[PDB]
Amino acid sequence: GVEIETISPGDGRTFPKKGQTCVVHYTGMLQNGKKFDSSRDRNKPFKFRIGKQEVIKGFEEGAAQMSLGQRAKLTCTPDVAYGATGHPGVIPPNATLIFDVELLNLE
Numbered sequence: 001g002v003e004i005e006t007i008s009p010g011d012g013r014t015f016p017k018k019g020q021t022c023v024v025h026y027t028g029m030l031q032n033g034k035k036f037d038s039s040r041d042r043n044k045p046f047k048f049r050i051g052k053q054e055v056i057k058g059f060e061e062g063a064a065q066m067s068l069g070q071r072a073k074l075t076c077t078p079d080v081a082y083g084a085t086g087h088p089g090v091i092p093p094n095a096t097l098i099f100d101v102e103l104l105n106l107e
Contacts, residue, residue: 002077063101
């Protein structure tokens with residue numbers, strides 16, 4: 001389950017498609033917890049493409065449901081990202097993930 005909470009401004013029409021390399025200022029957040037990941041710290045805004053299952057499934061479905069300039073807010077279910085496994089040391093099992101995602105992309 002991917003739930004989108006978009007901070008309004010953007011264009012609403014430039015949607016990511018297959019084979020398009022896109023640029024996202026993401027920001028990770030644990031529900032009832034602190035941050036765990038941020039592109040704002042490294043300031044390299046994470047160039048990635050669509051259609052290769054590179055990212056987790058909760059972040060993948062929310063990427064296609066945004067547009068250029070928009071500022072959404074993800075709520076990733078445990079089963080789509082790590083809730084069975086848990087990323088060792090960083091993500092516990094059965095974790096519900098929160099993301100601040102802005103789509104300032106190319107292509």
